[PDB]
Design a protein around this nucleic acid. Sequence first.
RNA 1: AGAUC
Length: 440
Amino acid sequence: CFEPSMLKKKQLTVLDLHPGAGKTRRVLPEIVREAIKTRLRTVILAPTRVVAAEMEEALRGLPVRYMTTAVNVTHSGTEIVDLMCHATFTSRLLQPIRVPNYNLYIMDEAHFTDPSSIAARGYISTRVEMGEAAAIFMTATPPGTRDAFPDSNSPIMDTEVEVPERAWSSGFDWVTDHSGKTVWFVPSVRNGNEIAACLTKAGKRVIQLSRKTFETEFQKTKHQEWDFVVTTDISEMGANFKADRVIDSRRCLKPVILDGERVILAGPMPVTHASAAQRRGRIGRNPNKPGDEYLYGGGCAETDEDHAHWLEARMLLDNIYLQDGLIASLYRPEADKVAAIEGEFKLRTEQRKTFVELMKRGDLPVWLAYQVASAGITYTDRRWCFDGTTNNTIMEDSVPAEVWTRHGEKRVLKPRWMDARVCSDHAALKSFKEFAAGKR
RNA sequence: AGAUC
Ligand SMILES: [Mn+2]
């Protein structure tokens, strides 16, 4: 557990705190109050807007500069503590700007494998190792450890069973015979839609959660009755339910780079241990309501090296300026997930600004932005969106999607580099069509 | 699938 000793330079502390143990509502305030007392320049790193909003609740009234729109408080101007999301921190490290020389970095959910979180751990741990700063990483599953069954406030009954992943008409009576409340993690929105329809058909009350619907739908879990929450991994962090069962497919979709050539949303494939621990961690939280059960349908992923986020983290970190041209390393327990030589992705000055602008203003995925920038293409030149090979054609409703270009021509979306994330769902395609049209 | 400005 935490002690003020850990606030000295050259100390990186990983607080292994199991789900429900108090990372956000107990330990984080404790750390922040001591940093405020001792006037340490501190940044708090939340993985998501949601967790940031949860953080402000727990830090209510303390002098914290919230560098996120997810929170709106009056700032005194004397605030020495900043709060932002992992991706915001990493993006700002990429700008030609003045990053404060924070003495203390506090990262909550330090297992997050978003490429910007991985890159932030690399930068932060390198700065600690150089003697410049102190850092505290909090998670239930410290990087480098593979325990899918961490401790809990109340004992959890874990049972491996065949978990249905499609609509069913028989053979799974235990799903619907249950009279409690179930949180069911599914690999995708479309997959949860089919299961939710099947459960609704059988007379259950279902709330569905995803990135696209979380805002409006999650509050319903607080105020309406419900039998099932069917959720994507949106609910792995910063989401809590009054449930007594989790059903876990133990699968996910994850971006994968095929042959160095393109990015697909591979799967469904096994989740990591960290993600299984988070999913299981939705229950077993209430010592007054024992009896919770975790029903899971397969193993966890033994190697995450196929995940594109590892290489994308190195693309960010190779281009984050440290000191007179040094390059930060990935956080050591995770450094073996990428086999690329040191500095392989460092871009020269001009191509680097393009990569940065492609990601921030352009909102392209890291891997894609890097392909464009490293080809010498300028930010506003969108011709590559239309001149790929035929197998790069983006479909809409099984018909080649089309775009009115800045030159008043209707062209089929066929990007020179295919990254499935630009058209994996409706909002993504819409954002990329605007990009291909020259609108941002 | 997720993520930020
Ligand atoms: Mn927490």
